[PDB]
């Protein structure tokens, strides 16, 4: 069965010449429902030719690779009334970029002001000057009405011959039926009742309902109960799937793009990455603090668990997985940014959500251990030089350039490893008063420095109990420490209120105080950008669609203490 299968992608825009094509293909298997689709099935003879037209997105979304990566070839349709247009450009970027070799169609050739050879002349111009080398053929491109003249042919039936293009120059699926199975996640969607589904074309082997598999990157061990697949429009069940086939597979683990699945018994595992993986993770848990759903809307585990995978779908830089812990998530993305409009979302749509300081994802590549590093970029008056020498020397930041710019400003790149420029953005203000400027960007990973930079020279102060903040008692803390709140605000115990001046944690009280027997300091604005990139490991940040707070993971100090200690 293998040999005849097809799978390709198809590109459109503005042009109403898309599909159209998909719903004009008619000519095909006239003989749970959901989703579909994703991807157009077909089935043309006159042998049962399976043609999987998978659907590629002209949205440029956070993508399009993460479709080519089961296709074989593409369908590029175009309209012959005005060329191809500026995001039928990006996405076969992306299709070259693979090793794809596309099939122009020209659409809408009925209309009156027709250009159907100016528009191929017009396609190499502005599709041949992304090298391939092959294609050339590209021939492949065929001429069509969707509203099924000259040129090619013309004509029998227009839609008659496409068949036979797309079965002549797409190539069968190279993957193997033998050995066991493994399939690489490829694309992925979500719904509330069947959790977080698979969507991959399979690389090998056969699959069927109830089995085992295995999860690819460290352990996963999970099974499903049931596989969805593509059929007509329709994304129907059946009793197995076996070869390359573009089926997709429900309930298991959280299921994740690039991440790939396999049987247990001799097999694993996938590779392909490609770039859009992510760098770092912090953890997200439910709001474990005294005013536990006291400011938000959403805080259950199961409503932010659902929240995150109706992320998983769209945006993929986004990795999502669970821990021992129920309610604590694994949350991975491309930057510490990339993490933080989801976090500053969440809160404005009403969630209450406690995250972990954002480790670095440390990946193994070729013996070495590597940590992803950050190419940084950054302006500033000439008097914070001497300020930004010795911060971004302390997180080991290599200088690679100045741009002195004659007056008193000068610019500095660098590259420093994500775990260093954790922190840094809150001083670079601090140090500069505001008028610093900068923004970074990952670069690669390379090996570790490793020692430790990305840590606080300070400690922090704790309040012992819940209560209100006593300007009496808050007046002479300000002395010991830099603060955080002022004239009384509603705190717990377990919640830090500022930074000592040394090393040491002082788990200070901010209740009665006292009075005797028988001016306060502007505090600090914490953006949620800035407590995450002010926490430890023993501290979370708490937040609330209308407020930030930032507590120790542990509140008791004394069940603090018996987990540190250490063994
Ligand atoms: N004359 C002529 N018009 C066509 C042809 N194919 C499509 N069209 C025009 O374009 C429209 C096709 O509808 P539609 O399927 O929504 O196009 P589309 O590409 O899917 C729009 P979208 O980009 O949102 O997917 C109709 O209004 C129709 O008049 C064709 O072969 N000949």
New binding site residues.
């Given amino acids: 069965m293998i040999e005849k299968l097809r799978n390709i992608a198809i590109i459109?825009?503005?042009?109403?010449?898309?599909?159209?094509?998909?719903?004009?293909l008619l000519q095909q298997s006239g003989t749970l429902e959901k989703e579909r689709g994703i991807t157009i099935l077909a089935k043309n003879t006159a042998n049962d030719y399976r043609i999987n037209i998978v659907d590629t997105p002209?949205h440029a979304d956070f993508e399009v690779e993460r479709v080519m990566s089961m296709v074989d070839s593409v369908l590029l349709?175009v309209?012959a009334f005005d060329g191809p247009m500026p995001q039928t450009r990006f996405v076969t970027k992306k299709a070259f970029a693979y090793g794809l070799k596309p099939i122009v169609v020209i659409?809408?050739?009925?209309?009156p002001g027709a250009r159907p050879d100016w528009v191929v002349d017009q396609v190499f111009d502005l599709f041949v000057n992304l090298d391939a080398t092959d294609e050339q053929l590209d021939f492949p491109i065929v001429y069509?009405?969707?509203?099924?003249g000259l040129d090619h042919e013309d004509m029998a039936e227009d839609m008659t011959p496409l068949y036979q293009a797309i079965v002549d120059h797409v190539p069968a699926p190279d993957v193997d039926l033998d050995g066991p199975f493994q399939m690489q996640i490829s694309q992925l969607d979500y719904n509330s009742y069947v959790g977080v589904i698979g969507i991959g074309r399979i690389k090998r082997g056969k699959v069927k309902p109830n089995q085992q598999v295995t999860i690819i990157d460290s352990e996963g061990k999970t099974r499903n109960a049931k596989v969805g697949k593509v059929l007509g429009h329709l994304g129907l069940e059946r009793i197995e799937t076996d070869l390359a086939e573009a089926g997709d597979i429900v309930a298991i683990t959280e299921l994740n793009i690039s991440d790939t699945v396999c049987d247990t018994q001799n097999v694993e595992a996938l590779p392909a990455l490609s770039v859009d993986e992510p760098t770092v993770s912090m953890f997200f848990c439910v709001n474990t603090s005294p005013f536990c759903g006291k400011e938000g809307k959403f805080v259950t585990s199961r409503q932010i668990l659902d929240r995150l995978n109706k992320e998983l779908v769209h945006n993929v830089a986004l990795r999502v997985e669970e821990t021992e812990d129920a309610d604590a998530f694994r949350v991975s993305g491309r930057g510490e940014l990339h993490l933080s409009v989801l976090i500053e979302n969440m809160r404005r749509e009403g969630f209450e959500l406690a995250v972990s300081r954002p480790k670095v994802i440390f990946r193994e590549i070729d013996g070495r251990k590597q940590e992803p590093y950050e190419n940084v970029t950054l302006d500033v008056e000439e008097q914070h030089q001497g300020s930004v020498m010795q911060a971004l020397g302390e997180r080991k930041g290599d200088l690679k350039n100045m741009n002195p710019d004659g007056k008193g400003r000068v610019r500095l790149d660098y590259v420093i490893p994500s775990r260093g420029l954790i922190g840094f953005r809150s001083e670079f203000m601090t140090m500069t008063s505001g008028t610093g400027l900068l923004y970074s960007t990952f670069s690669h990973y390379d090996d570790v420095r490793p020692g430790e930079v990305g840590q606080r020279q300070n400690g922090v102060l704790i309040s012992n109990g819940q209560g209100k903040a006593v300007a009496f008692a808050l007046f002479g803390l300000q002395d010991r420490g830099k603060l955080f709140l002022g004239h009384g605000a509603e705190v717990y115990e377990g919640q830090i209120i500022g930074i000592h001046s040394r090393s040491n944690d002082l788990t200070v009280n901010c209740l009665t105080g006292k009075k005797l027997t028988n001016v306060l300091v502007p505090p600090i604005r914490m953006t949620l950008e800035q407590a995450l990139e002010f926490i430890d490991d023993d501290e979370l940040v708490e937040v609330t669609p209308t407020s930030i707070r930032i507590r120790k993971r542990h509140l008791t100090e004394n069940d603090r203490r018996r987990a540190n200690r250490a063994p």
Avoid: E
């Avoid at 459109?12 to 004009?24: C, N, R, Y």
């Fill in positions: 459109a825009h503005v042009d109403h010449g898309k599909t159209t094509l998909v719903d004009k002209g349709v309209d659409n809408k050739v009925d209309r069509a009405s969707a509203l099924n």
